[PDB]
């Protein structure tokens, strides 16, 4: 009784994309499934449902035009054919299957992992990492600038300092380019006497950049 | 269509104790309601069906009542595995989620650590400007963060973003990006972070001068 | 030019305790600075002068100190007469005036009351939609306040207005109107406003249903 | 026995030209040296511009300088501020100070005048529209009902607001006026009583606004 969507996909405005449903451990065709996406910081949203037969399809208002759902039971898989997409598709895709009711009402038990669908469509491009040093207990930072697409992975001296580090969540720029931020605390006298090197690893752009911080004036 | 709506949007609580979220649909949509529950990073797992019936594998401590236009979620004893979102759904119409009601366990009030940081060099050779307000440390989560150019407001320029609650400390992080372009930036001589908390019993302001 | 800055921009106190302002300036304007008085709608009273010299006719309890940059304000015991917004003057490149440090007085902490009013039948026929969302008796002074139609928050849409302490509960009392226009209110049924303050430990938010 | 007595009142247009008269009396004028300083609402205070103990050497501010003029006269002991080509961002509280210490010499200010306002905003005066809150539930659940009245589209200020031609003087709270997008402004008047006090009693808010001259009192009904 579980459910496997796609793992990762990046696409463009207006593009096509799949993503694919496993179902498995339960019978299918019995039942009937639905698309749910959730936005980052938002609350979850119905996208589209389909019979536990396939003979109705049901669609939400804004999504009626550009999306189309379908299903095998004999594969047990269910796909959704995403066409014409927009920045406001850009959500984690959830594949679920009914808790109660047989083939007769849209409760939801079991959810799947969900599938993450990128329309950003912006070049890939290395993150810009530049230091924030300490004044005068002190603090100090580094700052990731202008880099695509998610993730971003950050860690002290190859991850030496793991204690008192805070990694803040990404953000959105009017220029749709991320720019995340990463800072540590540390007593005053052990500033001068030790090194702080932020690595910045990034796998699409393939940019890993070690910077280290001093406090210079 | 029909659009429901939750009460309480962040509710402080603590462990083993009675929890009491109210959703209203603003139609009658009878017995017909679900209640979910999310945790960060994890799929969403269903609490509660018809508002009367539970679903297996599920704890027995919460419970749900209500019918018609008023609902009602109940939990008698809360635990460690109670603190994520919680959305309320009703199938009489467009399929369709509350604004959710997230727990949290900042009981405990602290002052929030504010370190203000002028934007690198780097980035002043790339032409951009970063000024970067730091708050650190802090619970309760709720916050107020103003940029004061010159004794001036700056509104729309400022990025803020909040971490989630930390196990061991429970405490929450909170920065604020203000970015400029190189021309307003060296236009403008100082620089000035306000910060409004709960902790503080003065909000606490911290700033600087361009290029010292 | 210079242009000073000042620390808490809102301090609270209560009589007879020690008050401490700090308004530190850019540049060094040495030991030539002014500290001043403004009651609402009255004109402002010149406290002290040189920041070192009393200016006459002042209370003894005020007194500053500080050199260089660094300047403080420091009152030994607190009075009912002394509570006014207070800003302080530099003259010694460009004269101007900070953003001015105003102290009330804190003595409980209260649940703000809310009270969700909808738009009247006469202005609906103006084609002109307020709604009134009031929060009564509660401080501190300080709250915050969202705005939520059919789920989603409006930001620009909302204006704010606070009236001082009565002296009688000192409580300040907040009001917040949300203006647009007709169609946008019929389209939307459900409206709500929520509320922030620290006397509730749950946000606590007043709705309701078009018509 | 230094007294400042500033002009009362004034309104204009965009644009326009406006003579700000500061009188002084009680001490010697031509001693010492003058100087206007402005408040724009919920603002800081702003230096706008000072002239000297002869009237010579006249200073002014950046943003001021073009079409601003301070001028004094020794012989009447009178300060005129005359401005022309008024814009939005100089609608403020003008007043005419003193030096306190120096003579002459420094930037010092003791002795400031009453205050005089000058509106820019170049908008027609039109009568308040008075929209009644209706009561929000009969039930008492916050241990008093609330009731209020709304005045949108006045102008200018000010507008006074009694209830029961005063009858109803506790539990009011009177907020202050908002700038509005179409520049006309705006206030809000509320009042809590018990609910059982709500069948038995009419509530009534007279509306007072005195340049449109319209005085309007409207009842509270659900």
């Known amino acids: 009784v579980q459910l496997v969507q796609s793992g990762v996909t990046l696409v463009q405005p207006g593009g096509s994309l799949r993503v694919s449903c496993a179902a498995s451990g339960f019978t299918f065709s019995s039942y009937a499934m639905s698309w749910v996406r959730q936005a980052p910081g938002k609350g979850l949203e119905w996208?589209?449902?389909?019979?536990?037969?396939?003979?109705?399809?049901?669609?939400?208002d804004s999504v009626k035009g550009r999306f189309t759902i379908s299903r095998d039971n004999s594969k047990n898989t269910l796909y959704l054919q995403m066409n014409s997409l927009r920045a406001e598709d850009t959500a984690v895709?959830?594949?679920?299957?009914?808790?109660?009711?047989?083939?007769?009402?849209?409760?939801?038990?079991?959810?799947?992992?969900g599938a993450l669908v990128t329309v950003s469509s912006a070049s890939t491009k290395g993150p810009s990492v530049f230091p924030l040093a300490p004044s005068s207990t002190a603090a100090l930072g580094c700052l990731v600038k202008d880099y695509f697409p998610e993730p971003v992975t950050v860690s002290w001296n190859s991850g030496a300092l793991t204690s008192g580090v805070h990694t803040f969540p990404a953000v959105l720029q009017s220029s749709g380019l991320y720019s995340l931020s990463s800072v540590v605390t540390v007593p005053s006298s052990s500033l001068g006497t030790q090194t702080y090197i932020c690595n910045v690893n990034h796998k699409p752009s393939n940019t890993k950049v070690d910077k280290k911080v001093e406090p210079k004036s | 269509d029909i659009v429901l709506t939750q009460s309480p949007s962040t509710l402080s609580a603590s462990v083993g104790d009675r929890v009491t979220i109210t959703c209203?649909?603003?139609?009658?949509?009878?017995?017909?309601?679900?209640?979910y529950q999310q945790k960060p990073g994890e799929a969403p797992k269903l609490?509660?069906?018809?508002?009367?019936?539970?679903?297996s594998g599920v704890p027995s401590r919460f419970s749900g009542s209500g019918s018609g236009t008023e609902f009602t979620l109940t939990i008698s004893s809360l635990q460690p595995d109670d603190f994520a979102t919680?959305?309320?759904?009703?199938?009489?119409?467009?399929?369709?989620?509350?604004?959710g009601t997230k727990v949290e366990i900042k009981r405990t009030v602290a002052a929030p650590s504010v370190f203000i940081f002028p934007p690198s060099d780097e980035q002043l050779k790339s032409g951009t400007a970063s000024v970067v307000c730091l708050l650190n440390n802090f619970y309760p989560r709720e916050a107020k963060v103003q940029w004061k150019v010159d004794n001036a407001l700056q509104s729309g320029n400022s990025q803020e973003s909040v971490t989630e609650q930390d196990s061991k400390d429970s405490t929450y992080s909170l920065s604020s990006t203000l970015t400029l372009s190189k021309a307003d930036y060296e236009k403008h001589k100082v620089y000035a972070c306000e910060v409004t908390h709960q902790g503080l019993s003065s909000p606490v302001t911290k700033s600087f001068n361009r290029g010292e | 030019d210079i242009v000073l800055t000042q620390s808490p921009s809102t301090l609270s106190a209560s009589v007879g305790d020690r008050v401490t302002i700090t308004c530190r300036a850019s540049?060094?304007?040495?030991?030539?600075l002014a500290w001043y008085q403004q009651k609402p709608g009255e004109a402002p009273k010149l406290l002290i002068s040189?920041?070192?010299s009393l200016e006459s006719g002042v209370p003894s309890r005020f007194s500053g100190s500080g050199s260089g940059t660094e300047f403080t304000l420091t009152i030994s015991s607190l009075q009912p007469d002394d509570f006014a917004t207070y800003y302080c003057?530099?003259?010694?490149?460009?004269?101007?005036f900070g953003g001015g440090t105003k102290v009330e007085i804190k003595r409980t902490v209260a649940a703000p009351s809310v009270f969700i009013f909808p738009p009247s039948d006469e202005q609906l026929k103006s084609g002109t939609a307020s709604v009134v969302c009031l929060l009564n008796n509660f401080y501190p002074r300080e709250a915050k306040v969202q705005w939520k139609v059919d789920n989603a928050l409006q930001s620009g849409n909302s204006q704010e207005s606070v009236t001082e302490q009565d002296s009688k509960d000192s409580t300040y009392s907040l009001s917040s109107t949300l203006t647009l226009s007709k169609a946008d209110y019929e389209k939307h049924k459900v409206y709500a406003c929520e509320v922030t303050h620290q006397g509730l430990s749950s946000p606590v938010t007043k709705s309701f249903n078009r018509g | 026995q230094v007294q400042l007595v500033q002009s009362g009142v004034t309104l204009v247009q965009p644009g326009g030209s406006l003579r700000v008269s500061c009188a002084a009396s009680g001490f010697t004028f031509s001693s010492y040296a003058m100087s206007w300083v402005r408040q724009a609402p919920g603002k800081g205070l702003e230096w706008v511009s000072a002239?000297?103990?002869?009237?010579?050497?006249?200073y002014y501010a950046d943003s001021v300088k073009g079409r601003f003029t301070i001028s004094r006269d020794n012989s009447k002991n009178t300060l005129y501020l005359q401005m022309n080509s008024l814009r939005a961002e100089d609608t403020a509280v003008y007043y005419c100070?003193?030096?306190?210490?120096?003579?002459?010499?420094?930037?010092?200010?003791?002795?400031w005048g009453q205050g005089a306002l000058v509106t820019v905003s170049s908008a027609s005066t039109k009568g308040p529209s008075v929209f009644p809150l209706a009561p929000s539930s009969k039930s008492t659940s916050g241990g008093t009902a609330a009731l209020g009245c709304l005045v949108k589209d006045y102008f200018p200020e000010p507008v006074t607001v009694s209830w029961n031609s005063g009858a109803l003087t506790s539990g009011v709270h009177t907020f202050p006026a908002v700038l509005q997008s179409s520049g006309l402004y705006s206030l809000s008047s509320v009042v809590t009583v018990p609910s059982s006090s709500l069948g038995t009693q009419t509530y009534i808010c007279n509306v007072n606004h005195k340049p449109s001259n319209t005085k309007v009192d409207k009842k509270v009904e659900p």
């Open positions: 100070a003193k030096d306190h210490r120096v003579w002459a010499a420094g930037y010092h200010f003791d002795y």
């Open positions: 002239i000297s103990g002869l009237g010579g050497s006249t």
């Open positions: 540049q060094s304007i040495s030991s030539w």
């Open positions: 003057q530099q003259y010694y490149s460009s004269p101007t």
């Open positions: 040189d920041a070192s």
